[PDB]
Design a protein around this nucleic acid. Structure first.
Lengths: 505, 156, 246, 23
DNA sequence: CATAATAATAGTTTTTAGTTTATT
DNA sequence: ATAAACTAAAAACTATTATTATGG
């Protein structure tokens, strides 16, 4: 399903007071957090729905007509209109604009607000993979005053937990600190509770909430529910995944000049010689070799592309040592057993994984993705299950399908004669590399092209005056490298390059 | 082609190099010709993209921003496009050879890198670096940019 | 329509919410029959510039549009007559608009045909860059020449800041370094830069005006260096602290 | 939940991008 | 040759292989 | 001779609808 997240924000003057006016009020900074969340969701999940409500405010807005409870936006895909609506209250005097058009001061029932957000959840006609609600305050004293309403509120919250709603609470700015557990000590749905101090901290996890992460993060689904055939009949359902996948820009949309309507496009194939109109059955494909213009149908081409049925044809076992690094064709894929169609597939898969790990060999297999495709030989490397220090499976157990190139996949290169160098120069390079050595992490970079693309997208979506500029991590720290090295490069250059070498020419 | 370039380490190093496609995807350079089934003529065939009806001068390109649609002219995108530099191939850093896994091998081709054609000192520097990296179990992180319109790349 | 003047000209109202909310401006344009387009067409003569956006910058870079402030178009509205384009709401303009303003004005809003007033002169001047960087004497001579050619010497300020007056601001003249308290030499120097007579307290020949200063004890010096001078001292009287330039 | 992006439930925590860090 | 029926079909999104157009 | 996009993405997750095994 999707994710249901509702940002629940008080309006009872508990967000307008500030420790100092140089620091953001508990209100406006929450607005910035929510807007950042909207942006991140736009980047990540279009199909999710998010809502924002206000309670304790003087007026109200909700179908249940529960007073002092005003929904600002309902469970919907994020929209720039919503974000700018928040922005009009974001920052200084944005809370003043709020007071002017919205106001606050009244009390509420947390039972009542829980009822309202439960109504919001019942409203959506779409399946939610998660039931998240986000509460913004620094204070639990309103219902910390009366025990009856507090008991009713906690009973309602337990009920909503029974419904599967996961309540989460944030530490908000307060001069007297959050001072937790005045009401909220066990009224929080938590999978791992570790907060019991007064927590004068003005934040709990607001840093990443404000952090603009740029990723799509599509939900997991197998790239192919293929069948692994050992010989012809020992077949198991197997799941194939692109454990990594080069992301690309969203395609452009054809819009009108004045109304920006998505333009319905149609490319008819027609006889220009007679001005008539053609049909798919009315044309024939051709390729001319030498004096012969060979004419075919496209279909005939498709069936001459038919070699093997979709599946896996095990071709044998080759030791992992027999693999050349430069023999790479296209990014590898992950292999996982599936019991959906073949039961016992996972037991056999585990047996094979352990055995290939022992004997240190790869199962070379003839692979056909789907019909009308020439099967390819691919090496399946037994991929272990790797768990981090947190025992989180960082590398799943399975197999690594690497594509084995064919004879033509290479290209003849105008090689050059082999030339050696002095071992002193080798030591110079070793020392220089040691100077410029750096620890590698998988997520160490982003595509600056796509980054600035999203930056521009956000700017126009927010109709900004000027876009934020994406930083290019891929740009080297030339000054830092010169600082690290010194004249080692000059020494090696004199060791190698005579004092007439043209750097480029 | 010959792709002459410079391996750039900091600013103090610049070595003329020749890196070509070693392993790559294959496909014929001659594609089909959809001709008529009756006169076997392609010139009689014709496609006609039609926008509704309007011409190509009534249309712009747009982009779906979440729930919202954004007008975005191609001139504006080119102006705001992050533009890198062409034929610049600099080194980004040095990380352990064990740190990297072939599971993250991107692209569809394998590029073998030589030094400049007939540059003895370039070959000497290349061999010295090769031996150093080999003895150190060492792999080099580099930024690849083919031309001005090329996207910058991070590769091993 | 009501004012068909705005019809037949395509307007890219990309931001109007600067004076009126942009939809309201679109309503006014439509009621006047103007063509509203959300993207700048080739026939979009002018673009209404409300709030500032990157799209504004693109429009500026793309020399195809006329940057129109909403206030100027509000003038066109409330007048019920289409105001001609002018360079005080206009930021980025087509070359046709460039030559249009070079014709109707001197590109500053100062016309070549229709006379000036206080307001347009002030606006043209302020639009011209702030211009005070040269030496005081070069511009002093320029002011003097303009006053001679234009009969502008009639200013009450015309006798202590630009040309031909001599004084004693130093205990010894030809000695530009001596300074003694007990008089208003500083005040005399501060005055010598106001009305239009040159700051001179050195032995000079071509100087025509010699004036006894507020340091009247240097009448000895005034007369001693008067022998080196070719001009005599007058009985002294802007023009009345201790002065005779008449 | 530990090791999970609370922004994207069912998705692991997203580290800051970071860059080259010489050793 | 009738009727509380029932369920095997289908139709939405992803992500491969077709291709321009400069690019040397 | 094409290193950006060439051009349309072959594919399941997760949700429904007409079948009839039959009810009579």
């Amino acid at each position: 399903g999707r994710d249901s997240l509702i940002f629940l924000v008080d309006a009872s003057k508990a967000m307008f007071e500030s420790q100092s006016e140089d620091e953001l009020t508990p209100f406006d900074m929450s607005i910035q957090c929510i807007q950042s969340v909207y942006i991140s969701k736009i980047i990540s999940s279009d199909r999710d729905l998010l809502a924002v409500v206000f309670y304790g405010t003087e007026k109200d807005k909700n179908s249940v007509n529960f007073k002092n409870i005003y929904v600002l936006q309902e469970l919907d895909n994020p929209g720039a209109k919503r974000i700018l609506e928040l922005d009009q209250f974001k920052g200084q005097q944005g809370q003043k604009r709020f007071q002017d058009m919205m106001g606050h001061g009244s009390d509420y029932s947390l039972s009542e607000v829980l009822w309202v957000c439960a109504n919001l959840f019942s409203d959506v006609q779409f399946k939610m993979s998660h039931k998240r609600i986000m509460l913004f305050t620094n204070e639990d004293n309103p219902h910390g005053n009366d025990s009856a309403k507090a008991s009713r509120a906690r009973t309602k919250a337990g009920d909503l937990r029974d419904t599967g709603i996961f309540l989460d609470l944030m530490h908000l700015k307060k001069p007297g600190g959050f001072d937790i557990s005045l009401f909220y000590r066990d009224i929080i749905s938590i999978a791992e509770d570790e907060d019991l101090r007064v927590h004068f901290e003005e934040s709990s996890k607001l840093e990443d909430l404000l952090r603009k992460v740029r990723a799509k993060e599509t939900r997991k689904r197998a790239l192919s529910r293929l069948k692994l055939k050992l010989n012809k009949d020992i077949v198991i359902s197997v799941g194939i995944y692109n454990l990594v996948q080069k992301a690309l820009k969203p395609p452009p949309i054809k819009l009108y000049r004045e109304t920006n309507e998505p333009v319905k496009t149609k490319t008819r194939t027609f006889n220009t010689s007679t001005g008539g109109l053609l049909l798919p059955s009315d044309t024939k494909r051709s390729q001319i070799y030498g004096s012969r213009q060979i004419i075919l149908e496209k279909e005939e081409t498709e069936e001459l592309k038919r070699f093997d049925d979709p599946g896996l044809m095990l071709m044998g076992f080759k030791p992992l040592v027999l693999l050349k690094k430069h023999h790479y064709l296209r990014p590898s894929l992950f292999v996982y057993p599936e019991e959906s169609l073949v039961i016992g597939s996972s037991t056999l898969f585990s047996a094979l994984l352990i055995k290939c790990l022992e004997k240190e060999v790869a199962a070379l297999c003839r692979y056909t993705p789907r019909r009308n495709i020439p099967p390819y030989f691919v090496a399946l490397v037994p991929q272990e299950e790797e768990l981090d220090d947190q025992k989180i499976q960082v590398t799943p157990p399975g197999f690594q399908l690497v594509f084995l190139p064919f004879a033509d996949d290479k290209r003849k290169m105008p090689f050059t004669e082999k030339i050696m160098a002095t071992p002193e120069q080798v030591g110079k390079m070793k020392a220089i590399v040691e100077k410029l050595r750096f620890t590698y992490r998988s997520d160490s970079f982003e595509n600056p092209v796509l980054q600035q693309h999203f930056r521009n997208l956000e700017a126009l979506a927010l109709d900004l005056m000027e876009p934020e500029q994406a930083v290019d991590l891929t740009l080297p720290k030339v000054e830092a490298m010169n600082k690290r090295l010194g004249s080692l490069v000059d020494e090696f250059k004199e060791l190698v390059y005579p004092p007439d070498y043209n750097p480029e020419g | 082609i010959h792709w002459p370039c410079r391996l750039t380490i900091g600013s103090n190093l610049s070595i003329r190099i020749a890196a070509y496609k070693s392993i790559l995807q294959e496909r014929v350079k001659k594609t089909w010709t959809v001709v008529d089934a009756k006169t076997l003529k392609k010139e009689d065939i014709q496609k006609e993209t039609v926008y509704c009806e309007v011409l190509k001068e009534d249309i712009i390109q747009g982009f779906r921003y979440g729930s919202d649609i954004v007008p975005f002219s191609k001139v504006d995108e080119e102006q705001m496009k992050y533009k890198s530099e062409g034929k610049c191939f600099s080194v980004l850093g040095f990380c352990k050879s064990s740190q990297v896994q072939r599971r993250f091998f991107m692209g569809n081709q394998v590029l073998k890198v030589f030094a400049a054609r007939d540059d003895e000192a370039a070959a000497v520097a290349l061999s010295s670096l090769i031996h150093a990296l080999d003895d150190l179990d060492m792999v080099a992180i580099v930024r690849y940019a083919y031309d001005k319109r090329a996207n910058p790349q991070v590769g091993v | 329509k009501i004012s068909n003047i705005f019809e037949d000209v395509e307007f890219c109202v990309m931001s109007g919410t600067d004076s009126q909310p942009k939809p309201d401006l679109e309503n006014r344009i439509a009621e006047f029959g103007g063509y509203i387009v959300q993207n700048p067409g080739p026939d979009t003569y002018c673009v209404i510039a409300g709030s500032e956006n990157i799209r504004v910058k693109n429009i500026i870079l793309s020399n195809k549009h006329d940057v129109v402030k909403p206030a100027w178009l509000l003038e066109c509205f409330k007048t019920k007559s289409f105001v001609p384009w002018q360079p005080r709401f206009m930021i980025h303009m087509c070359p046709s608009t460039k030559e249009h303003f070079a014709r109707e004005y001197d590109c500053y809003g100062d016309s070549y045909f229709i006379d000036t007033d206080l307001n347009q002169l002030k606006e043209v001047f302020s639009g011209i860059k702030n211009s005070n960087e040269q030496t005081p004497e070069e511009m002093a001579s320029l002011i003097a020449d303009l006053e001679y050619r234009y009969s502008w010497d009639c200013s009450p300020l015309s006798m202590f800041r630009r040309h031909t007056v001599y004084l004693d601001s130093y205990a010894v003249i030809n000695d530009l370094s001596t300074k003694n308290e007990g008089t208003r030499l500083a005040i005399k120097a501060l005055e010598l830069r106001f009305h239009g007579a040159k700051v001179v307290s050195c032995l000079a020949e071509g100087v025509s005006h010699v004036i006894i200063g507020e340091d009247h004890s240097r009448v000895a010096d005034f007369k001693a260096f008067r022998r080196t001078f070719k001009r005599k001292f007058k009985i002294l009287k802007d023009k009345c602290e201790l002065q005779e330039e008449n | 939940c530990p090791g999970e992006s609370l922004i994207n439930p069912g998705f692991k925590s997203k580290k800051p991008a970071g860059g080259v860090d010489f050793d």
